[PDB]
């Protein structure tokens, strides 16, 4: 549990926001994209993994399941690949609410620069740090825990 | 102790490599830019902050410390933003020791990729995970000790 993340890809403005999510956390990480490839999954996957213990994967998609870059950054980063099966049917819903709490924070900020990449890692942050723990304390205590 | 990071830029292939180290860790996060801009250089730390808890960065040069645009950044993100004149002189010598150690890694992954940004994140990958405790297991340590 400390090293699950589940992917989850959004759109807005015409582009891709992709999104890690530490499922035991609600911490986040995500970047924009023109477009999900496998190889700019695969990037994101390798750079989240330099970053994070991640041992398991829960892929958006069948395409990025499928992907044999995205399974070569796995195997590279050690990490496990799954797919992103609900058998929790409450799954469905919490990253739908994610996502759409993500946009609401990207209009409150979406004035305040100029590119999209921008206001998205300022909503990082406000969800990260929004408090009672905030996500970002949560994630460093369970790893923190776990190491011990 | 636990919210003190230290910029770093170092240059490989043309190219602009940025490093945030966590100073207590050693643990690093990297980016590839076409040349060190204070856009750039603010964008990096918007990044870092909605990542880890960041009290404090020292700059890693006079451009980075004067531009109003970082200066913004580090407001927005709550970060004190300082210099980095070397008080204590082993720093130099660490940071110039780390940059040898980097491009060693990435010389060793180089043609485990075509982009130069990969390859920089599988250093990145690499160092934080080397062992006896690793740089990642230290940060989460450090921050979990604090926050408790
Ligand atoms: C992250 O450091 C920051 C520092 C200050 C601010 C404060 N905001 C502004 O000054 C502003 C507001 C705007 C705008 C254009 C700007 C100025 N830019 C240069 C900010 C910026 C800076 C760096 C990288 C960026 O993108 C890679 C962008 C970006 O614009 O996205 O157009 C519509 O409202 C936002 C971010
Ligand atoms: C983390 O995902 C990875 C998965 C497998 C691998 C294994 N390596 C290769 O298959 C390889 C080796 C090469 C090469 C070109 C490639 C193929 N590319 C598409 C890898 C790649 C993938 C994604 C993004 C990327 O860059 C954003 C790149 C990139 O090339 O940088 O040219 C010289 O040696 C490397 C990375
Ligand atoms: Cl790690």
Redesign the interface.
């Known amino acids: 549990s400390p090293g699950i993340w589940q992917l989850d890809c959004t759109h807005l403005e015409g582009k891709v926001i992709l999104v890690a999510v530490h499922v035991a956390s609600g911490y986040i990480?995500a970047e924009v994209i023109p477009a999900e490839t496998g190889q700019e999954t695969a990037?994101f996957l390798?750079?989240l993994?330099?970053?994070?213990?991640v041992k398991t994967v829960h892929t958006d998609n069948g395409s990025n399941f499928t992907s044999t870059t995205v399974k070569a950054a796995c195997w590279?980063?050690g990490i496990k690949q799954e797919d992103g099966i609900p058998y929790n049917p409450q799954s469905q819903g919490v990253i739908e609410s994610m996502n759409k709490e993500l946009k609401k924070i990207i209009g409150q900020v979406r004035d305040?620069a100029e590119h999209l990449?921008?206001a998205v890692?300022?909503a990082?942050?406000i969800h990260?740090?929004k408090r009672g723990y905030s996500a970002?304390?949560r994630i460093?205590?369970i790893?923190?825990?776990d190491?011990?």
């Open positions: 990480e990037y390798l750079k993994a330099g970053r994070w213990p590279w980063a305040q990449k921008t890692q300022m990082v942050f990260n740090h970002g304390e460093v205590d790893i923190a825990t190491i011990q």
